[PDB]
Design an enzyme around this catalytic site. Structure first.
Site, PDB file in Angstrom:
ATOM      1  N   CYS A 109       0.841  -1.192   0.000  1.00  0.00           N
ATOM      2  CA  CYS A 109       0.000   0.000   0.000  1.00  0.00           C
ATOM      3  C   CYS A 109       0.875   1.240   0.000  1.00  0.00           C
ATOM      4  CB  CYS A 109      -0.935   0.027   1.218  1.00  0.00           C
ATOM      5  SG  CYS A 109      -1.855   1.576   1.300  1.00  0.00           S
ATOM      6  N   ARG A 112       0.051   4.619   2.858  1.00  0.00           N
ATOM      7  CA  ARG A 112       0.110   4.406   4.294  1.00  0.00           C
ATOM      8  C   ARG A 112       0.509   5.642   5.085  1.00  0.00           C
ATOM      9  NH1 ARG A 112       4.009  -0.451   4.937  1.00  0.00           N
ATOM     10  NH2 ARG A 112       4.631  -0.016   2.762  1.00  0.00           N
ATOM     11  N   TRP A 281      -9.057   6.385  -0.723  1.00  0.00           N
ATOM     12  CA  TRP A 281      -9.379   7.108  -1.940  1.00  0.00           C
ATOM     13  C   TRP A 281      -8.422   6.628  -3.006  1.00  0.00           C
ATOM     14  CZ3 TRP A 281      -8.075   9.821   2.585  1.00  0.00           C
ATOM     15  CH2 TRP A 281      -6.727  10.210   2.680  1.00  0.00           C
ATOM     16  N   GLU A 286      -4.867   3.950 -10.663  1.00  0.00           N
ATOM     17  CA  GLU A 286      -5.653   2.739 -10.488  1.00  0.00           C
ATOM     18  C   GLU A 286      -6.805   2.708 -11.473  1.00  0.00           C
ATOM     19  OE1 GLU A 286      -6.164   1.299  -6.324  1.00  0.00           O
ATOM     20  OE2 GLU A 286      -5.690   3.373  -5.763  1.00  0.00           O
TER      21      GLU A 286
HETATM   22  C1  HEM Z   1      -6.144   6.563   1.859  1.00  0.00           C
HETATM   23  C2  HEM Z   1      -5.775   6.395   0.584  1.00  0.00           C
HETATM   24  C3  HEM Z   1      -5.203   5.071   0.038  1.00  0.00           C
HETATM   25  C4  HEM Z   1      -4.525   4.990  -1.109  1.00  0.00           C
HETATM   26  C5  HEM Z   1      -4.208   6.181  -2.041  1.00  0.00           C
HETATM   27  C6  HEM Z   1      -4.133   3.605  -1.305  1.00  0.00           C
HETATM   28  C7  HEM Z   1      -3.422   3.129  -2.382  1.00  0.00           C
HETATM   29  C8  HEM Z   1      -3.104   1.813  -2.614  1.00  0.00           C
HETATM   30  C9  HEM Z   1      -2.651   1.240  -3.852  1.00  0.00           C
HETATM   31  C10 HEM Z   1      -2.420   2.037  -5.152  1.00  0.00           C
HETATM   32  C11 HEM Z   1      -2.459  -0.073  -3.662  1.00  0.00           C
HETATM   33  C12 HEM Z   1      -1.951  -1.081  -4.719  1.00  0.00           C
HETATM   34  C13 HEM Z   1      -2.966  -2.196  -4.901  1.00  0.00           C
HETATM   35  C14 HEM Z   1      -3.556  -2.100  -6.274  1.00  0.00           C
HETATM   36  O1  HEM Z   1      -2.957  -1.416  -7.141  1.00  0.00           O
HETATM   37  O2  HEM Z   1      -4.627  -2.717  -6.491  1.00  0.00           O
HETATM   38  C15 HEM Z   1      -2.810  -0.378  -2.284  1.00  0.00           C
HETATM   39  C16 HEM Z   1      -2.748  -1.597  -1.661  1.00  0.00           C
HETATM   40  C17 HEM Z   1      -3.250  -1.938  -0.421  1.00  0.00           C
HETATM   41  N1  HEM Z   1      -3.833  -1.057   0.472  1.00  0.00           N
HETATM   42 FE1  HEM Z   1      -3.851   0.953   0.248  1.00  0.00          FE
HETATM   43  N2  HEM Z   1      -4.615   2.862  -0.240  1.00  0.00           N
HETATM   44  C18 HEM Z   1      -5.288   3.733   0.612  1.00  0.00           C
HETATM   45  C19 HEM Z   1      -5.921   3.359   1.780  1.00  0.00           C
HETATM   46  C20 HEM Z   1      -5.877   2.115   2.361  1.00  0.00           C
HETATM   47  C21 HEM Z   1      -6.566   1.727   3.581  1.00  0.00           C
HETATM   48  C22 HEM Z   1      -7.451   2.737   4.329  1.00  0.00           C
HETATM   49  C23 HEM Z   1      -6.257   0.440   3.844  1.00  0.00           C
HETATM   50  C24 HEM Z   1      -6.677  -0.489   4.993  1.00  0.00           C
HETATM   51  C25 HEM Z   1      -7.439  -0.060   6.002  1.00  0.00           C
HETATM   52  C26 HEM Z   1      -5.373  -0.023   2.788  1.00  0.00           C
HETATM   53  C27 HEM Z   1      -4.825  -1.277   2.693  1.00  0.00           C
HETATM   54  C28 HEM Z   1      -4.200  -1.797   1.594  1.00  0.00           C
HETATM   55  C29 HEM Z   1      -3.820  -3.181   1.375  1.00  0.00           C
HETATM   56  C30 HEM Z   1      -4.016  -4.361   2.350  1.00  0.00           C
HETATM   57  C31 HEM Z   1      -3.240  -3.259   0.167  1.00  0.00           C
HETATM   58  C32 HEM Z   1      -2.675  -4.526  -0.510  1.00  0.00           C
HETATM   59  C33 HEM Z   1      -3.738  -4.968  -1.511  1.00  0.00           C
HETATM   60  C34 HEM Z   1      -3.359  -6.246  -2.221  1.00  0.00           C
HETATM   61  O3  HEM Z   1      -2.396  -6.935  -1.783  1.00  0.00           O
HETATM   62  O4  HEM Z   1      -4.043  -6.588  -3.228  1.00  0.00           O
HETATM   63  N3  HEM Z   1      -5.164   1.026   1.921  1.00  0.00           N
HETATM   64  N4  HEM Z   1      -3.173   0.799  -1.697  1.00  0.00           N
HETATM   65  N1  LIG Z   2      -7.010   2.872  -3.447  1.00  0.00           N
HETATM   66  C1  LIG Z   2      -7.253   1.651  -3.211  1.00  0.00           C
HETATM   67  N2  LIG Z   2      -6.678   0.689  -3.944  1.00  0.00           N
HETATM   68  C2  LIG Z   2      -6.611  -0.606  -3.522  1.00  0.00           C
HETATM   69  C3  LIG Z   2      -6.221  -0.938  -2.224  1.00  0.00           C
HETATM   70  C4  LIG Z   2      -6.161  -2.264  -1.822  1.00  0.00           C
HETATM   71  C5  LIG Z   2      -6.458  -3.274  -2.730  1.00  0.00           C
HETATM   72  C6  LIG Z   2      -6.839  -2.958  -4.028  1.00  0.00           C
HETATM   73  C7  LIG Z   2      -7.173  -4.059  -5.011  1.00  0.00           C
HETATM   74  N3  LIG Z   2      -6.067  -5.034  -5.115  1.00  0.00           N
HETATM   75  C8  LIG Z   2      -6.423  -6.010  -6.157  1.00  0.00           C
HETATM   76  C9  LIG Z   2      -5.213  -6.802  -6.661  1.00  0.00           C
HETATM   77  C10 LIG Z   2      -5.743  -7.994  -7.426  1.00  0.00           C
HETATM   78  C11 LIG Z   2      -6.137  -9.127  -6.721  1.00  0.00           C
HETATM   79  C12 LIG Z   2      -6.643 -10.228  -7.400  1.00  0.00           C
HETATM   80  C13 LIG Z   2      -6.753 -10.196  -8.787  1.00  0.00           C
HETATM   81  C14 LIG Z   2      -7.306 -11.384  -9.495  1.00  0.00           C
HETATM   82  C15 LIG Z   2      -7.840 -11.263 -10.778  1.00  0.00           C
HETATM   83  C16 LIG Z   2      -8.358 -12.381 -11.424  1.00  0.00           C
HETATM   84  C17 LIG Z   2      -8.345 -13.619 -10.789  1.00  0.00           C
HETATM   85  C18 LIG Z   2      -7.815 -13.740  -9.507  1.00  0.00           C
HETATM   86  C19 LIG Z   2      -7.297 -12.620  -8.860  1.00  0.00           C
HETATM   87  C20 LIG Z   2      -6.365  -9.059  -9.492  1.00  0.00           C
HETATM   88  C21 LIG Z   2      -5.853  -7.961  -8.808  1.00  0.00           C
HETATM   89  C22 LIG Z   2      -5.435  -6.731  -9.578  1.00  0.00           C
HETATM   90  N4  LIG Z   2      -5.157  -7.081 -10.987  1.00  0.00           N
HETATM   91  C23 LIG Z   2      -6.917  -1.628  -4.416  1.00  0.00           C
HETATM   92  C24 LIG Z   2      -8.185   1.267  -2.104  1.00  0.00           C
HETATM   93  C25 LIG Z   2      -9.242   0.377  -1.978  1.00  0.00           C
HETATM   94  N5  LIG Z   2      -9.768   0.348  -0.718  1.00  0.00           N
HETATM   95  C26 LIG Z   2      -9.185   1.159   0.211  1.00  0.00           C
HETATM   96  S1  LIG Z   2      -7.895   1.994  -0.580  1.00  0.00           S
END
Ligand code: HEM
Ligand SMILES: N=C(Nc1cccc(CNCCc2ccc(-c3ccccc3)cc2CN)c1)c1cncs1
Ligand code: HEM
Ligand SMILES: N=C(Nc1cccc(CNCCc2ccc(-c3ccccc3)cc2CN)c1)c1cncs1
Ligand SMILES: C[C@H](O)[C@H](O)[C@H]1CNc2nc(N)[nH]c(=O)c2N1
Ligand SMILES: C[C@H](O)[C@H](O)[C@H]1CNc2nc(N)[nH]c(=O)c2N1
Ligand SMILES: [Zn+2]
Lengths: 410, 410
Positions: A109, A112, A281, A286
């Site tokens: 993330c 953070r 947000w 994204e």
């Molecule tokens: C406040 C603004 C926030 C921004 C701009 C942000 C941004 C991001 C981005 C760009 C990713 C990369 C994952 C992806 O591209 O799909 C990510 C991952 C992640 N974020 Fe943040 N996030 C925010 C808030 C939060 C919050 C509030 C939480 C938890 C309470 C959180 C927990 C996580 C986790 C667990 C991941 C890993 C997701 C994964 O492994 O698929 N984020 N975040």
């Molecule tokens: N700003 C934000 N962003 C963000 C933060 C945490 C996680 C994510 C989404 N992480 C998705 C990664 C992922 C996982 C599984 C699969 C997948 C697809 C097909 C089959 C199986 C698995 C694909 C992806 C991304 N290609 C977005 C926020 C969303 N909430 C609070 S902050």
């Protein structure tokens, strides 16, 4: 045993000792690095107390009462509860600490820097899918805040036996539907084709269009999940225009303001919260890079380059890159002109470096997943590209978990 | 013990067994991933023979004569040479195999689809810096090939005792000088400020401009290194114009056609070649993104965005991204219009996926360093972004080595 990470754009060196506190494993070994694998891989009372103790020791350390009397009594009190029930209940304060630090510890993330300003909604008294709907609606309303988005997490009851899980079956509270076509194409978001049909299976009447907000599929206490439609007024959406190209509106693109992941599992002191939707947000890329321009997603580089009258005959004209920048300027412009919170990849990555320096200073480290921290465009013109990062697994944490329809005894 | 890597843009799955042959270590452990650390960290006769045997066993396996009589005799012959001299000499064929497979095994190299078409220049009879100059000039001339660039490596004598190393002190055969200024700015390439002054120390008369090709500093058999000027006619350069923006030429930018890394160490069967300059051709982003747009390099995003009349007042206008694409279109256009070999990041990354499928098929794997394979812009619109990669260290290999001025007993 006291590792160094260097920034090669700034020659800044940070010393990591926090990795020594790391508990879980990474997937890598001495002989193979798995840093680019997307996914890396019931709980008994015996394993449970060490995890509780570890957590309570860091909790009481953080409120500057480590080893105090309240700490020992709480340690005793949780052990006695684990003896009796083979599980235990977190205090409200321990729940808020755990969630905040699960976010603090999320190495993938980039957002953070905000980890301590997280709004924790305790939904552990919830017993039905309707109660989940209620809690989730209140989450969306609160986090959305009329576009001035606010970080939040809603935490449903913890796993107990395993057959009584609370799950949100949506991968995010707000996602657009995806329908295959007669000609095998895909209308809407291809990412959600299976989930869209799952809702149609459970009875969703689909308005087979592009940006149809999916219903909520909510499973409570292990029971079969139930469909709910978020009130449209709670779903804030941004129509995507460009500050220069007026044909851009004719693309009719729009996205939802609130990114709220709902398929992850929150681990706090060995307790497992299988339903814990969290929202913050968007970083612009994204939507503009991944959501719109992934081949397996909306895949609009085609049409945008067309309207820009780009040389699309070969790869080396970089028409794909050129259209990608215009799309991301359009997402940022559209969100900002509507006063809906968004952060560009430059601001967010700079903030993450500043965050890293804070963590290394006041915590001895910051687990970070370079593969995920570097934005999906313009990598090296952002400061995280040049920043060495150590990835390691700290707890409390957010974990992946199987999709519930693959596991649920139906 | 038979790992799987997935491509998430294509749902393609490849099974890796080649990592089982991995010898060296990665820097990662079970508890910490070091996949984003830039640099991860005399030889006795006892350690030497296992390395020789391992290499000769894969060599004779590759020519379909593993365990044959010629294999056992060569194994015996090298053991007898290690007994007598505590080292040994590769056959010309074994040298060509080793170099080609060192390139094949370079996990950070996206260009490896070409690994088997490598021209090996055996310079192991070289004894003086002048002979090195000669060999290097012939390398440049051959690899440059009037713009139709050809892959090549020149291999100077192997390390023996350690105090008698052959080193090219340049990091690349052809690099532009870098001078600090009175006002503390930097004219030319800031990457080479120390090396430029090292040549001025050893006596280089610098034409303190921008794109001044540095002299060669060549150390032979451990002796102090000596300055040599590559004939200008052998140094092919491309003036950078844009296919649309005619002010682009007024930037006066130019780059050299031939990328030829000369500071790495080639390991083949435990033998160490400390001078082994190798050259291929450029992926466009190396010049257009890193060389020109790194803050710590030429750093021209400033001026290009100015001339494009971009909104430079805040980060979120993506003026940096927009100028970055124009610069890379200009590099590719300029190189192609001059018939000087270059590959765009789209073509090269697609080729690398195809390469990966070949290697997994006809070799059981392909060590790959995602952090380095994904291009420094437009990451996710290229297929390598979505490709899981296993990184592991195979031999023969290219290794980093200290800069010679940090180690050389002077
Ligand atoms: C406040 C603004 C926030 C921004 C701009 C942000 C941004 C991001 C981005 C760009 C990713 C990369 C994952 C992806 O591209 O799909 C990510 C991952 C992640 N974020 Fe943040 N996030 C925010 C808030 C939060 C919050 C509030 C939480 C938890 C309470 C959180 C927990 C996580 C986790 C667990 C991941 C890993 C997701 C994964 O492994 O698929 N984020 N975040
Ligand atoms: N700003 C934000 N962003 C963000 C933060 C945490 C996680 C994510 C989404 N992480 C998705 C990664 C992922 C996982 C599984 C699969 C997948 C697809 C097909 C089959 C199986 C698995 C694909 C992806 C991304 N290609 C977005 C926020 C969303 N909430 C609070 S902050
Ligand atoms: C033929 C066209 C080639 C292309 C397009 C190419 C491209 C690249 C690129 C883009 C990198 C990333 C390193 C960086 O960004 O600085 C790289 C790394 C590397 N390449 Fe290739 N290369 C080519 C030929 C070769 C040859 C002929 C060899 C060896 C004989 C080689 C060996 C390596 C090695 C060892 C690395 C790792 C460098 C490091 O760790 O700093 N490459 N290549
Ligand atoms: N196409 C090509 N590309 C290419 C291939 C291999 C290696 C390289 C260059 N890899 C340099 C990575 C690097 C290493 C050290 C430092 C550094 C800087 C300051 C202090 C200490 C170390 C910085 C960098 C890059 N920032 C380019 C070719 C060049 N020949 C044949 S193919
Ligand atoms: C193969 C690779 O691990 C995969 O595509 C990852 C790469 N890095 C990523 N980084 C972010 N932020 N989000 C992602 O989905 C991915 N996907
Ligand atoms: C910190 C990080 O490891 C460093 O900047 C790496 C990242 N990936 C890279 N990838 C390539 N191809 N070249 C590089 O110089 C780097 N630098
Ligand atoms: Zn690793």
């Amino acid at each position: 045993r006291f590792l160094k990470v260097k920034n090669w754009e700034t020659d800044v060196v940070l010393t990591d000792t926090l990795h020594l506190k790391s508990t879980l494993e990474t997937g890598c070994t001495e002989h193979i690095c798995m840093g680019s694998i997307m996914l890396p891989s019931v709980a008994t009372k015996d394993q449970l107390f060490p995890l509780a103790k570890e957590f309570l020791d860091q909790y009481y350390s953080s409120i500057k009462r480590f080893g105090s009397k309240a700490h020992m009594d709480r340690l005793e009190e949780v052990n006695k509860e684990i003896e009796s029930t083979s599980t235990y209940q977190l205090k409200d304060t321990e729940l808020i600490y755990g969630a905040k630090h699960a976010w603090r510890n999320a190495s993938r993330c980039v957002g953070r820097i905000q980890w301590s300003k997280l709004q924790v909604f305790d939904a552990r008294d919830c017993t039905t899918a309707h109660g989940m709907f209620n809690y989730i609606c209140n989450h969306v309303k609160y986090a959305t805040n009329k576009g001035n988005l606010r970080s939040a997490i809603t935490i449903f009851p913890q796993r107990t036996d395993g057959k009584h899980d609370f799950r949100v079956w949506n991968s995010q509270l707000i996602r657009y539907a995806g329908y295959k076509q007669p000609d095998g194409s895909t209308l809407g978001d291809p990412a959600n084709v299976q989930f869209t049909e799952i809702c149609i299976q459970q009875g969703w009447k689909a308005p087979r269009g592009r940006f149809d907000v999916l219903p909520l599929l909510l499973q409570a206490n292990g029971n079969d999940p139930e469909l709910f439609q978020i009130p449209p007024e709670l779903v804030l959406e941004v129509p995507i225009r460009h500050p220069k190209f007026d044909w851009f509106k004719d693309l009719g693109l729009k996205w939802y303001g609130l990114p709220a992941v709902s398929n992850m599992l929150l681990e706090i002191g060995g307790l497992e919260f299988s339903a814990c939707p969290f929202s913050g947000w968007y970083m612009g890329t994204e939507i503009g890079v991944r959501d719109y321009c992934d081949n397996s997603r909306y895949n609009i580089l085609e049409e945008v380059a067309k309207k820009m009258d780009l040389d699309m005959r070969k790869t080396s004209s970089l028409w794909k890159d050129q259209a990608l920048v215009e799309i991301n300027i359009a997402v940022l412009y559209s969100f900002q002109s509507d006063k809906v919170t968004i952060v560009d990849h430059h601001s967010a990555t700079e903030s993450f470096i500043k965050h890293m320096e804070n963590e290394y200073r006041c915590r001895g480290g910051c687990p970070a997943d370079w593969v995920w921290i570097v934005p999906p465009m313009s990598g090296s013109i952002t400061p995280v590209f040049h920043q060495e990062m150590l990835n390691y697994r700290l707890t409390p944490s957010f974990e992946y978990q199987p999709d519930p329809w693959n596991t649920h005894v139906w």
